[PDB]
Amino acid sequence: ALHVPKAPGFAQMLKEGAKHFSGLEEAVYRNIQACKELAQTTRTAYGPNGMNKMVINHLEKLFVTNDAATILRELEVQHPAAKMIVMASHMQEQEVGDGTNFVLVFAGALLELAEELLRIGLSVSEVIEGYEIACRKAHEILPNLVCCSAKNLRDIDEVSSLLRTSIMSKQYGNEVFLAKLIAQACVSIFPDSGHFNVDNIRVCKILGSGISSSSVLHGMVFKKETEGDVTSVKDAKIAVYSCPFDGMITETKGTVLIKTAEELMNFSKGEENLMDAQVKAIADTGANVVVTGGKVADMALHYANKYNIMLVRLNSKWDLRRLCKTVGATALPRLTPPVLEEMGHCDSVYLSEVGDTQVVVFKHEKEDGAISTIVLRGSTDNLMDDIERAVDDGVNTFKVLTRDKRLVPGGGATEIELAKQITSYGETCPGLEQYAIKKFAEAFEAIPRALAENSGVKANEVISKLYAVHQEGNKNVGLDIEAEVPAVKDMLEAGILDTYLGKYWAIKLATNAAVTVLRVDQIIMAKPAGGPK
Amino acid sequence: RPVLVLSQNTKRESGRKVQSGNINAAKTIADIIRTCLGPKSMMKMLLDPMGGIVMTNDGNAILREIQVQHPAAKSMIEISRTQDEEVGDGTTSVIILAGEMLSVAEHFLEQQMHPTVVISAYRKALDDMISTLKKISIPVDISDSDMMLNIINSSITTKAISRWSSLACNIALDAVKMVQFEENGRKEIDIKKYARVEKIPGGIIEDSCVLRGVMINKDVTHPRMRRYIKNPRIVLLDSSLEYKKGESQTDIEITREEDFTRILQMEEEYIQQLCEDIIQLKPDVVITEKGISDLAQHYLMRANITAIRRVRKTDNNRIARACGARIVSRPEELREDDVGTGAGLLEIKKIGDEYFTFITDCKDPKACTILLRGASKEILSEVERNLQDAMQVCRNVLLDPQLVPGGGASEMAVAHALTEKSKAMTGVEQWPYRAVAQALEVIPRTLIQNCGASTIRLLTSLRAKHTQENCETWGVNGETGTLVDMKELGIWEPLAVKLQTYKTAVETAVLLLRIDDIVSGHKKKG
Amino acid sequence: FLQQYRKQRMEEMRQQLHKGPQFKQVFEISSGEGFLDMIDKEQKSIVIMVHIYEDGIPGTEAMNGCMICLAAEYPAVKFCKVKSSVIGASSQFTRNALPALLIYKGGELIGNFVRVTDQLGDDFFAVDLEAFLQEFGLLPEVLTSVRNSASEDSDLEID
Amino acid sequence: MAAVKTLNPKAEVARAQAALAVNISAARGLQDVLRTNLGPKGTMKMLVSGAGDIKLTKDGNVLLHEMQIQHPTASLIAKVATAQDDITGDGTTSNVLIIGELLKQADLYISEGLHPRIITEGFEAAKEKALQFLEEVKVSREMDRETLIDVARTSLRTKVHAELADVLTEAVVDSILAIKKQDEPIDLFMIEIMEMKHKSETDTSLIRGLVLDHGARHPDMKKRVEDAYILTCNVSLEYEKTEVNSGFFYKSAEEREKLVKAERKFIEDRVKKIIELKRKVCGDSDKGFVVINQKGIDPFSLDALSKEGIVALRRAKRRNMERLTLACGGVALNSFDDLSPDCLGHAGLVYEYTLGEEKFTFIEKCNNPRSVTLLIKGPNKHTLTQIKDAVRDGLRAVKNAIDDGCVVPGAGAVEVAMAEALIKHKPSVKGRAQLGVQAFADALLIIPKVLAQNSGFDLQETLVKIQAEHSESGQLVGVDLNTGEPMVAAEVGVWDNYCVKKQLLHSCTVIATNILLVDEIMRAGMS
Ligand SMILES: Nc1ncnc2c1ncn2[C@@H]1O[C@H](COP(=O)(O)OP(=O)(O)O)[C@@H](O)[C@H]1O
Ligand SMILES: Nc1ncnc2c1ncn2[C@@H]1O[C@H](COP(=O)(O)OP(=O)(O)O)[C@@H](O)[C@H]1O
Ligand SMILES: Nc1ncnc2c1ncn2[C@@H]1O[C@H](COP(=O)(O)OP(=O)(O)O)[C@@H](O)[C@H]1O
Ligand SMILES: [Mg+2]
Ligand SMILES: [Mg+2]
Ligand SMILES: [Mg+2]
């Protein structure tokens, strides 16, 4: 009478390291608690007043940022429910590019209120049904909350104003300058054709002179040097070769068979003459810059130097295609001279020196092209990485604007209006789903509450003021950050707007993650064993 | 430091203790499978060291999965394997008999009788047992299919397949009959090589059947091949239909520009020549034990020929036997005789989620495939074991058409005859003779025990019944525990199985009786 | 879909019918000097595989059965087993190096696999470990009735 | 202790009633775990593997495989369920439940000193009677679209959420009707299942064509072709080394250049044949040319093909040869020795979709595609896996419904009717096998019991209501999972595959009979 044996049946047959969680209080509440913990550990980095977090991964690499997706990626999350919510956040990042913190906060609040509903007596199925109905109602309501539209994407000032809000949460202190840079870079890209490619915006990080000295370049910058002695070309005629700058050889086996002395004494001379002829044929087509994807032979380099040809060696083939796209050339497979149509033209190619880094710059004087490079300066690698993440957020916001031009007010105004409307709708519906609908509406309060908490003011007073104003009839009113007391102001007048499509996708993904977590009733975890990766 | 004659790990024991240990180990081996005999036997679950599960009630299948340290038990297991391989039936009976004779020999070894006298008495009793069995046997007309089916049924009433008895009996009889071959004045059955049993989990057991041909788990090499041919002409090959290196080192030396292209064109032309040699015989199906090149596939398909590659050698031999073909290595030596005509249908159909190739309408085939479809893998393995037992019994009857009454009737009759013979020796070896004669009653005893009836009353009644004149066929009903004549119940066994059981049991007893010393621990020294 | 290895199932089926007489067991080394004088002894041209294990650790019995099947199929190789504690391994070996595949050839190591659970699994089959060993070319390249082998006087005739 | 332990001291043996107790306990544990899976109202289980992969499932087979159990009887039940899923594709949870309840009911009588042999005899007699009843109760109906829709819903609602179940039902029924040929067995290899990870679960649909997981490997390839000629080939368009160890021998740089130029004449000739065919079939820019190759294409041939406006794909799946020949209507070629326009398929639209680092190629607007594809779209990997398993189950159910000429009412109605018939037939069976027949009937009654329990009602009251209604009216009445009152399953549209029911009966009876007869679990392969 000193030990409790394992119950007969499944309990005994379970493996030594396996874990079995079943029922409501042993599985659902534990999953909800884990998701709440994840939401709590990410909450403080929300909004313009969000705080960066120093995250060190298992490889001792240091990340400092307030991007929720990056923070979740760099955290070794082990709980399966938190893993699912992180997957939802990553899907939101992939689909849109901004709103990951919103997804996580909304999912956490939804699961918290779901636990509360389950405690008061509601069932899992009824909670899920109410959440789905309320999500459908929110998706129906959302288009009516649209304030204005982009109505122009070729204007630098309009695009900068639109993109300021997206990169205002990150790098709150200096967002106008970054907005102008990203606007110029995006407007250079995005030609008359409606398609916009995010990959066409390149970012180069050069250390030394602070982020305020960053600049946008209509072209490409490579952190390399020139093989030859020519280091500056003013009327470049780039010829791009996917083959090494060397005489091509066979593929089975190359064996030189010598049977007479004359062949032995003439082989090297003939090879040199052939290489000289090939290089001179390349040069006679007006080419003065040659970019190769392979190695550069000594003889080829010498003969290129003789004819004043600038040699650049790009090892990575992604950079090769990017250069072909930005200059307007074709990567030749052989060392033949390039035909007129295959010749790439860049207005100026030169070897420069920024900070202490040797770079080769393909520069276009025209304010257009296919690929634009943002040269990021700074005084720390981590700071430059954070600025690059902000630039990525801005570019993704521009891409979303190209996809859909509708905008909704930010600063929690959209969330508060959605909460009010869904709460009003929930009164009409009878049955047990009204509680779930009201809880779904109340889960929208976590966004203005998080903003108020991060801004340093009382969240309850801000929420009450927002409800009072929205009940009056002003549906475009959010909290004012630049205030020491709880205050609200019009978001439309202040220009604090976020994309409608991003909010739509974020709400959908958060609701799906919450209901998917709720549907789980039993957990059968295998023994962890090993598997570091 | 120490000096020894033998090695340190060499352990030796001898005397009455060794004989007692050997006999105890044999009795333990017998007791392991004692309850797995008779129509009312219960199955056993065996866990393989590899993780597999064997669920059966066969003596050899149970015993081959047991690892033992006592060499007497190893001898008994080898005896079980010998009985299984020689005749295919009577595996539990021989083990039980060996245990009983060793027990009744231990009884005499406790006294002052030398083991050699017991062995001589055992050999004399074995000779008399053979004589009595040959005397009480009856002939069988192999032409009568009903009698053969009844024999197979009596053979498989004690296995898990007995619930589907007519189907299993017909399958075994048909397979054995159609695998029978007679070439160059030599008669062979060859159940081991041909008549392959292919089991596919799923379906119902009643859907199982024996095919008039061979089924293999292969699919056509290309989608545009025909998956259904009415009367195909089949050609079987060994060599690959692809360009391959020679044996000698044959490096080339290319100096002209066109030599590389010429080499490639010659490779393609060689493939085309091989395919043309195949096509010249105008076949419909080509089967190869090795790979077939894609270009070879195209050239064959241009002539509307279905090709299957990478078939096992055993499967190819079975196909050749079934469809009357001849395997040809070099395609240029193909003749009209080598082409296999006789297959009445070829079909590649889908079973579950896998493709299977059927050649299942052959006329006069010498090979077959038994298609087992059951609940799971273990059930199908047990069904395959039972079918193997049935086919072995059928082959034994076909080779020797002598028949012997079953259910312990033959053993009780032999015991009574041997006792009557012993009533006249008047020597000193008569006691072991009579003891080993009466030791045959263990199998009627265990039949009664498994039936659950009273052992003593039934055994006494049977022994009294066998003392009459014409009562050699009186045995025990295995599922009701009553004394019934076996010319009414119909349970009969082949004479070969009984002869092998008695010979093997008596010789095992002799072998383990001839031993009184055990030395162990020495290295193999090799 | 060539990764599914359809031949693996037929190879396992053929391995199930490996031998008739017995499954045989992996030799258990009882001492260190026994280990030394069996690795040093025997022909150097044969591959000797040594199995390192301790009782109770998971991931062992599966590879015991795998080596049993390999010894059944392969008569040349000399699969053997020995307790980890008997040799006297250190604490790190006894805590994170239980699965150890010691391969001997020519009197020296040619295969030194340890911590093979990630690359093999926990309940892997014989074919899986066979393929794993074949990945490095570690595997060297009828059924008699029972036996055949029975001075040097052979035969003559009349002369 | 026993004989084996005497012979092998390090052996584990369970003997006589011990074996029965162990087997029945294992079966009861498996049944207790898998009870909550049955029915659309069943709970969803989450499985985490050793590496940390998350899987959401409701299948009996999937749950069994990823359930950390190392039991012999559980292994036998898992093998039976695996065979059931392999052949029929449905009924795994019902299989496990029926086996467990058969063993429990048999134990109920065995614990009273009764021999298992009589129970097995009763089981086999009841199995024969139940098979006869199933033959006499099946609904032989014409498999029109509505019946297939009903069956597909009956499966997918049990597998996934209601709206996703409806979407998958439409997709599965449409795909099966698309690939089906009259009086010809349905080949399920012709329905390619592709997974995308960018949209919601409800965005999955059916493409009347083919979707490929690889795209063009040349940046200058056309990203969209309207009218496409499809060339399905299995010819290597990359450089191939000679089999007989050729090697090159030259004496000057000019000779080396000549040899380099002349070593590609074979592949250049094949590409020239392709280009000549393309120029012959389409002399304008209206019709595009698409080449799908099972083997790789080197950059030189890729550039040569792209210069002619030809989009080319390489390293295609082996089954894609048959899929494209059946969908586009062309002829798969293993060599360009004699190629004509009659070997070219047609595709009314070919475009490429880019998703992350993966490039997908779409082939729509075919004339009468005999092979279609199912695009699985979801925000999560586990969602994709669950939808794929549900689609497999639904496809198997629809194929079974098409194959058999009949369909059996579900919702536990057929099991209740079988139990009633077995109870009626019990007096006919002689001997003490009547107890086995009664145990078989009670075991068959597990399905409505578990359905009612999962729906939230009480087993006994609901079961007696169903039985009383069936006895009074004679209609095949089953459990209504929303109200609990009996409903005519045929009228509502709750259909079960007849082959699934027959396989369930056969396999469950066989495995229960074989397990009940085991009297010794043994493990002596060591030492
Ligand atoms: N100047 C501002 N004043 C008030 N609220 C702001 C301001 N700028 C941004 N926000 C709010 O911050 C939110 C953006 O939070 P953010 O940190 O970008 O999360 P995520 O990266 O997940 O989108 C928006 O919903 C917006 O309403
Ligand atoms: N219906 C029956 N009634 C009585 N005895 C039977 C019956 N059927 C078979 N037997 C006996 O059972 C024995 C077969 O048992 P079995 O399980 O095959 O053991 P073994 O494999 O050693 O022959 C035969 O010797 C036969 O005499
Ligand atoms: N909408 C429904 N109403 C009533 N009964 C249903 C409904 N859908 C399914 N069922 C019944 O519930 C059972 C579901 O079994 P299922 O979970 O598919 O087990 P398995 O996966 O082993 O086939 C079926 O036998 C069916 O008769
Ligand atoms: Mg943001
Ligand atoms: Mg027998
Ligand atoms: Mg189902």
Short mmCIF file of N, CA and C in Angstrom, two decimals, chain A residues 275-350:
data_model
loop_
_atom_site.label_atom_id
_atom_site.label_comp_id
_atom_site.label_asym_id
_atom_site.label_seq_id
_atom_site.Cartn_x
_atom_site.Cartn_y
_atom_site.Cartn_z
N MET A 275 43.95 32.09 -77.41
CA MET A 275 43.37 32.89 -76.33
C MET A 275 43.40 34.38 -76.67
N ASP A 276 44.51 34.85 -77.24
CA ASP A 276 44.60 36.25 -77.65
C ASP A 276 43.57 36.58 -78.70
N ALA A 277 43.38 35.69 -79.68
CA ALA A 277 42.39 35.92 -80.72
C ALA A 277 40.98 35.99 -80.14
N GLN A 278 40.66 35.09 -79.20
CA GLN A 278 39.34 35.12 -78.58
C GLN A 278 39.11 36.41 -77.81
N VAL A 279 40.10 36.83 -77.03
CA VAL A 279 39.94 38.05 -76.23
C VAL A 279 39.85 39.27 -77.14
N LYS A 280 40.63 39.30 -78.22
CA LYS A 280 40.57 40.43 -79.14
C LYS A 280 39.24 40.46 -79.88
N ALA A 281 38.70 39.29 -80.23
CA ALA A 281 37.38 39.25 -80.86
C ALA A 281 36.31 39.76 -79.91
N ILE A 282 36.42 39.41 -78.62
CA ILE A 282 35.49 39.95 -77.63
C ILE A 282 35.62 41.46 -77.53
N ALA A 283 36.85 41.96 -77.51
CA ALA A 283 37.08 43.40 -77.33
C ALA A 283 36.67 44.21 -78.55
N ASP A 284 36.78 43.63 -79.75
CA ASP A 284 36.51 44.38 -80.97
C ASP A 284 35.04 44.72 -81.13
N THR A 285 34.15 44.08 -80.37
CA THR A 285 32.73 44.39 -80.40
C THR A 285 32.37 45.61 -79.56
N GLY A 286 33.36 46.41 -79.17
CA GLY A 286 33.13 47.57 -78.34
C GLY A 286 33.04 47.29 -76.86
N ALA A 287 33.11 46.02 -76.45
CA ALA A 287 33.01 45.69 -75.04
C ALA A 287 34.22 46.21 -74.27
N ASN A 288 33.97 46.72 -73.06
CA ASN A 288 35.02 47.18 -72.18
C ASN A 288 34.90 46.67 -70.76
N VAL A 289 33.79 46.03 -70.41
CA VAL A 289 33.61 45.39 -69.11
C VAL A 289 33.16 43.96 -69.36
N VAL A 290 33.84 43.01 -68.72
CA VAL A 290 33.52 41.59 -68.86
C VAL A 290 33.26 41.03 -67.47
N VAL A 291 32.11 40.39 -67.30
CA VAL A 291 31.73 39.76 -66.05
C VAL A 291 31.64 38.26 -66.28
N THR A 292 32.40 37.49 -65.50
CA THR A 292 32.45 36.05 -65.65
C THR A 292 31.92 35.38 -64.39
N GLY A 293 31.32 34.20 -64.58
CA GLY A 293 30.78 33.45 -63.46
C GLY A 293 31.75 32.42 -62.93
N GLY A 294 32.82 32.16 -63.68
CA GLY A 294 33.82 31.20 -63.30
C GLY A 294 35.16 31.84 -62.99
N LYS A 295 36.20 31.01 -62.98
CA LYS A 295 37.54 31.49 -62.70
C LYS A 295 38.08 32.29 -63.88
N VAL A 296 39.16 33.03 -63.62
CA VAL A 296 39.82 33.85 -64.63
C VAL A 296 41.22 33.30 -64.83
N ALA A 297 41.53 32.86 -66.05
CA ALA A 297 42.84 32.33 -66.35
C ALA A 297 43.88 33.44 -66.37
N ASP A 298 45.14 33.04 -66.19
CA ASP A 298 46.23 34.01 -66.20
C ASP A 298 46.41 34.62 -67.59
N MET A 299 46.40 33.79 -68.63
CA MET A 299 46.57 34.30 -69.99
C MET A 299 45.40 35.19 -70.38
N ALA A 300 44.18 34.77 -70.06
CA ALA A 300 43.01 35.59 -70.38
C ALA A 300 43.04 36.91 -69.63
N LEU A 301 43.44 36.89 -68.36
CA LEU A 301 43.55 38.12 -67.60
C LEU A 301 44.60 39.05 -68.20
N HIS A 302 45.75 38.49 -68.59
CA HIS A 302 46.80 39.31 -69.18
C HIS A 302 46.34 39.95 -70.49
N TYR A 303 45.66 39.18 -71.33
CA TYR A 303 45.22 39.73 -72.61
C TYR A 303 44.07 40.71 -72.44
N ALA A 304 43.22 40.51 -71.43
CA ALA A 304 42.20 41.50 -71.12
C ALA A 304 42.84 42.80 -70.63
N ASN A 305 43.88 42.69 -69.81
CA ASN A 305 44.60 43.88 -69.37
C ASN A 305 45.25 44.60 -70.54
N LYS A 306 45.75 43.83 -71.52
CA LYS A 306 46.38 44.44 -72.68
C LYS A 306 45.39 45.28 -73.48
N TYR A 307 44.14 44.84 -73.57
CA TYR A 307 43.13 45.52 -74.37
C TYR A 307 42.24 46.44 -73.55
N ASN A 308 42.59 46.70 -72.29
CA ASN A 308 41.85 47.61 -71.41
C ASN A 308 40.40 47.16 -71.25
N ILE A 309 40.23 45.98 -70.68
CA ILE A 309 38.92 45.41 -70.39
C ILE A 309 38.81 45.22 -68.88
N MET A 310 37.74 45.74 -68.30
CA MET A 310 37.51 45.60 -66.86
C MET A 310 36.91 44.23 -66.58
N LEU A 311 37.58 43.46 -65.73
CA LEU A 311 37.14 42.11 -65.39
C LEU A 311 36.55 42.09 -63.99
N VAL A 312 35.35 41.52 -63.88
CA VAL A 312 34.69 41.30 -62.60
C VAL A 312 34.31 39.83 -62.50
N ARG A 313 34.60 39.22 -61.36
CA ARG A 313 34.33 37.80 -61.14
C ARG A 313 33.22 37.68 -60.10
N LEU A 314 32.05 37.24 -60.53
CA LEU A 314 30.91 37.02 -59.65
C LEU A 314 30.74 35.51 -59.46
N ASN A 315 31.03 35.04 -58.25
CA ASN A 315 30.95 33.60 -57.98
C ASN A 315 29.51 33.13 -57.91
N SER A 316 28.65 33.87 -57.22
CA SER A 316 27.27 33.45 -57.04
C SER A 316 26.47 33.71 -58.31
N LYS A 317 25.78 32.67 -58.79
CA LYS A 317 24.99 32.77 -60.01
C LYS A 317 23.70 33.56 -59.83
N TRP A 318 23.18 33.65 -58.60
CA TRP A 318 22.05 34.55 -58.36
C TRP A 318 22.44 35.99 -58.67
N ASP A 319 23.63 36.41 -58.22
CA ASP A 319 24.12 37.73 -58.56
C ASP A 319 24.33 37.87 -60.06
N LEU A 320 24.72 36.78 -60.72
CA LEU A 320 24.90 36.83 -62.17
C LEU A 320 23.58 37.14 -62.87
N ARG A 321 22.50 36.43 -62.50
CA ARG A 321 21.21 36.74 -63.11
C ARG A 321 20.72 38.13 -62.73
N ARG A 322 20.96 38.55 -61.49
CA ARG A 322 20.54 39.89 -61.09
C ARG A 322 21.27 40.96 -61.91
N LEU A 323 22.56 40.77 -62.15
CA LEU A 323 23.31 41.71 -62.97
C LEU A 323 22.83 41.69 -64.41
N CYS A 324 22.54 40.50 -64.95
CA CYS A 324 22.00 40.42 -66.30
C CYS A 324 20.68 41.16 -66.40
N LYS A 325 19.83 41.04 -65.38
CA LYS A 325 18.55 41.74 -65.38
C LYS A 325 18.74 43.25 -65.30
N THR A 326 19.63 43.71 -64.42
CA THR A 326 19.75 45.15 -64.21
C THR A 326 20.50 45.85 -65.34
N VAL A 327 21.42 45.16 -66.01
CA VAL A 327 22.18 45.81 -67.07
C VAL A 327 21.52 45.61 -68.44
N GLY A 328 20.88 44.47 -68.66
CA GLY A 328 20.25 44.20 -69.94
C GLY A 328 21.13 43.36 -70.84
N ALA A 329 21.76 42.34 -70.27
CA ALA A 329 22.66 41.46 -70.99
C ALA A 329 22.15 40.03 -70.91
N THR A 330 22.83 39.14 -71.63
CA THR A 330 22.51 37.72 -71.65
C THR A 330 23.75 36.93 -71.27
N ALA A 331 23.60 36.00 -70.33
CA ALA A 331 24.72 35.20 -69.87
C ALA A 331 25.10 34.19 -70.95
N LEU A 332 26.17 34.47 -71.67
CA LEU A 332 26.59 33.59 -72.75
C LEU A 332 27.19 32.31 -72.18
N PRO A 333 26.95 31.16 -72.82
CA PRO A 333 27.53 29.91 -72.32
C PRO A 333 28.94 29.67 -72.82
N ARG A 334 29.28 30.26 -73.97
CA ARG A 334 30.60 30.14 -74.57
C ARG A 334 31.32 31.48 -74.47
N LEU A 335 32.58 31.49 -74.90
CA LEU A 335 33.40 32.70 -74.88
C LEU A 335 33.36 33.45 -76.21
N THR A 336 32.29 33.27 -76.98
CA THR A 336 32.16 33.99 -78.24
C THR A 336 31.90 35.47 -77.98
N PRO A 337 32.29 36.34 -78.91
CA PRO A 337 31.96 37.76 -78.77
C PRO A 337 30.46 37.97 -78.75
N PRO A 338 29.97 38.88 -77.92
CA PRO A 338 28.52 39.06 -77.80
C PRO A 338 27.95 39.82 -78.98
N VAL A 339 26.79 39.36 -79.45
CA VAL A 339 26.07 40.03 -80.53
C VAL A 339 25.50 41.33 -80.00
N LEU A 340 25.00 42.18 -80.91
CA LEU A 340 24.58 43.52 -80.52
C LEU A 340 23.46 43.48 -79.49
N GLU A 341 22.51 42.55 -79.64
CA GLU A 341 21.37 42.51 -78.74
C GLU A 341 21.75 41.98 -77.36
N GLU A 342 22.79 41.15 -77.27
CA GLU A 342 23.19 40.54 -76.01
C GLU A 342 24.14 41.41 -75.20
N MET A 343 24.55 42.56 -75.72
CA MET A 343 25.45 43.44 -75.00
C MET A 343 24.69 44.21 -73.93
N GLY A 344 25.20 44.17 -72.70
CA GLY A 344 24.61 44.93 -71.62
C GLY A 344 25.23 46.32 -71.53
N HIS A 345 24.40 47.30 -71.20
CA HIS A 345 24.82 48.69 -71.14
C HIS A 345 24.54 49.25 -69.75
N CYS A 346 25.58 49.74 -69.09
CA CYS A 346 25.45 50.46 -67.83
C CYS A 346 26.17 51.79 -67.97
N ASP A 347 25.63 52.82 -67.32
CA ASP A 347 26.13 54.16 -67.57
C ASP A 347 27.51 54.39 -66.96
N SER A 348 27.84 53.69 -65.88
CA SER A 348 29.14 53.86 -65.25
C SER A 348 29.43 52.66 -64.36
N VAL A 349 30.57 52.02 -64.60
CA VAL A 349 31.06 50.93 -63.77
C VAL A 349 32.44 51.30 -63.25
N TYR A 350 32.62 51.24 -61.94
CA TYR A 350 33.87 51.68 -61.33
C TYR A 350 34.10 50.94 -60.03
#
